[PDB]
Design a binder for these strands. Structure first.
Lengths: 102, 49, 118, 206
RNA sequence: AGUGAACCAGUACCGUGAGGGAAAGGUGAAAAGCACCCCGGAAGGGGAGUGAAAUAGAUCCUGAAACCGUGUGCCUACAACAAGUCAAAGCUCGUUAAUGAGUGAUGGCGUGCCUUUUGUAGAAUGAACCGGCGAGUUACGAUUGCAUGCGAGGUUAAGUCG
RNA sequence: AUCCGGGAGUCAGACUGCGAGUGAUAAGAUCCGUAGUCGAAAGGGAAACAGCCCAGACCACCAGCUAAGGUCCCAAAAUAU
RNA sequence: GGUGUAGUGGUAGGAGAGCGUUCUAAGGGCGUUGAAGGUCGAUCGUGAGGACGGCUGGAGCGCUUAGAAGUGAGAAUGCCG
């Protein structure tokens, strides 16, 4: 059973029972979420709808807000006696999937 | 006032500038003097007027 | 009041050498060699975060071309057909379908073939 | 401002009205910071030196030639970059003391004693008399007035038995009334001044 | 570092001479400084003993790096490599527990660092490597900004007691 | 934009359109005027390429649309009409 | 504090705000039930940098607020080892 959803600025493939990582959501851990836009409902027969499939949602539960591992961005110009250094860790949320549209 | 909580008045003391201590401070490597010439030497310069 | 330069330089230098683990020979053991090599790696990693996003797009595109030529199309005609029908699948999901669910890929290729049949 | 009076043991033998120009005048906090910093930099003995290039016992000869030897041009065995050479810009003997103008000295004295009074941290007592210099009796007196912190004991004049008895106690400092500084009052938690010494201080701070 | 010199230093050493001139501190609380045995010409070592500790044994507190070895998990004899970075199968492990750690066949991309230059990968300049040391300071004046006290006024110098 | 005050650095430039002199209407030559880039500018194109064509990098993404230049294989996209 | 809009390449050079070393004062602490130093780790912060744990080691050392400086090293055909 397949569904494809628009989350963040991207698209993900989805299934009942599996967990997904995603851009930060504005929902506290333990609460429920509804992904409104469904792109395709595969599985046995596919529903290939113009932009979205009419009336299908996907339900989940937020599990955890985290941070990714650290990236360092360092920049210098050879022979020009100058450099600049910066770090960065990225937020995410983890979501469990339950009941692709029915 | 207790001797373990001193505080000068705001704007009254400033720190200091130390030249020749690395590139990122702004004044390493020639310490504000530009490239070569009479004004880049120790004791360089012309008399007043 | 004199300030010995005791243990500050060794800490900084040992932080640099720890980033050079796994390099070849004197590039993981001497401080000057490791310093230069680590600077070059910083440059390469910043460059390659931006080049990654191009490599996977070319990979997806070539797999989609391969799959579509099996359904009577080429990449450019099939993309036009999907746009004229208002379908908005990524090139990532399209390639994933092309390898896993050939029947879904054929459903989509038929919709595109009917769209540009007008 | 009125403070309560005590005897070498007793109770509330009335009160004592002190000046309002000295003990009640709303302290000024930057003036006190300035006084403390000036006084602490005033106690230094800046006796420190080092040897520059020309004081090190050493050489006037050019050690090798200027060219040919495949070397680096050198000028003396005693240069700043040679092991054992002379120091560039070290410590020199210096002064470290300066003076603030006269009105702010007086303002800091008034302000620090007035702060002591505004928190019931000054304790007035009729007299401190002793027929012999005994530390034990001074400690009993000190507990008679329930004083359990660092204390400045401001005495009058040739009250020599009291100053002897109050020495040597590791919480206690002793000063006479013609010799109080700004740094003595700020460091102690309380002041134990006698009635005579209080009027004598009011006579000089005016 | 501090005197050239913390130690038998104006010494050893260098020069016909006048003169130039170093290096080199630390067992343990207490020598209790290893009786006796074994291999060995000896040096050195292994037991046994001293001692809180000997991997504190006189080259004796701590004991970093260059540099030299021994043992092993993973790779390597059709391959042109500024030596990494991004993608990645197989094998081997299992941590400050989290989108874990080591190695890595194979594929894309990619001409060190510093100085001086209109301009450098430069066949322009410097560096064998590792460690230590090694460069805008102070006195007295002049000016501006900030801050505090007095305000048509402000402030004392030498000196005297302390 | 103008006015008062504290602190500077620069006084060796280079190539490419355009318009003139010196030269032989030679030079990656030399000396002026006018616009841009380089200097002090990474990223795409031009095989490789300071100065030409497109475009100005605060950071993260295994999302999307375009510029100059391109679509038989190396090497992404038409063996298009 | 919210929300909008706009900005955030950089050599010479100007301006702002901080990190770390040693020493002084005041306060509150730790230590043979093991300080400083050394070594290893898969840890935290926007940067200089900060912790916690193991092993080694044997007697001293942090933290807060203010002060003072012989206060930071990769390069000089540098000096000593």
């Amino acid at each position: 059973m397949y569904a494809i959803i628009k989350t963040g600025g991207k698209q993900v493939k989805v299934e009942v029972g599996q967990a997904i990582y995603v851009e930060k959501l504005n929902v506290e851990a333990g609460e429920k979420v509804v992904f409104d836009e469904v792109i395709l409902v595969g599985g046995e027969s596919t529903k290939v709808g113009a932009p979205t499939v009419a009336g299908a949602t996907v339900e989940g539960t937020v599990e955890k807000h985290g941070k990714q591992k650290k990236v360092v961005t360092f920049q210098y110009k050879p022979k020009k006696h100058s450099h600049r250094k910066q770090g960065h860790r990225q937020p995410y949320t983890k979501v469990m999937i339950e009941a692709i549209n029915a | 006032m207790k001797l373990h909580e001193l505080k000068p008045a705001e704007g009254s003391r400033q720190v200091r500038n130390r030249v020749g201590r690395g590139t990122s401070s702004g004044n390493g490597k020639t310490a504000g003097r530009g490239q070569k010439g009479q004004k880049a030497r120790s004791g360089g310069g012309v008399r007043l007027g | 009041a004199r300030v010995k330069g005791g243990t500050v330089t060794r800490k900084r230098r040992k932080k640099v050498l720890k980033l050079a683990k796994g390099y070849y020979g004197s590039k993981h053991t001497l401080f000057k060699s490791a310093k230069e090599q680590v600077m070059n790696s910083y440059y390469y990693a910043f460059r390659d975060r931006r080049q990654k996003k191009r490599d996977f797009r070319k990979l997806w595109i070539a797999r989609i071309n391969a799959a579509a030529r099996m359904n009577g199309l080429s990449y450019s005609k099939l993309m036009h057909g999907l746009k004229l029908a208002e379908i908005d699948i990524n090139r990532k999901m399209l390639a994933d379908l092309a390898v896993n669910d050939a029947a879904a890929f054929t459903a989509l290729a038929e919709q595109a073939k009917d769209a540009l049949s007008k | 401002p009125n403070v309560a009076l005590f005897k070498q043991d007793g109770t509330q033998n009335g009160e004592i009205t002190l000046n309002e120009e000295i003990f009640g005048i709303e302290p000024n906090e930057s003036v006190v910071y300035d006084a403390i910093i000036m006084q602490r930099a005033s106690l230094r003995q800046g006796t420190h030196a080092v040897k520059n290039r020309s004081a090190v016992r050493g050489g006037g000869r050019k050690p090798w030639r200027q060219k040919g030897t495949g070397r680096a041009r050198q000028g003396s065995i005693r240069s700043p970059q040679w092991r054992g050479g002379g120091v560039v810009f070290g410590p020199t003997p210096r002064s470290y003391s300066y003076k603030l103008p006269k009105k702010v000295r007086r303002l800091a004295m008034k302000s620090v004693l007035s702060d002591k009074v505004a928190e019931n941290n000054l304790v007035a007592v009729e007299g401190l008399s002793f027929d012999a210099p005994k530390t034990k009796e001074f400690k009993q007196v000190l507990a008679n007035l329930s004083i359990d912190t660092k204390v400045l004991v401001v005495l009058e004049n040739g009250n020599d038995f009291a100053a002897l008895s109050a020495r040597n106690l590791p919480n206690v400092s002793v000063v006479t009334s013609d010799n109080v500084s700004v740094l003595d009052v700020v460091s102690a938690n309380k002041v134990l001044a006698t009635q005579t010494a209080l009027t004598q201080i009011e006579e000089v701070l005016a």
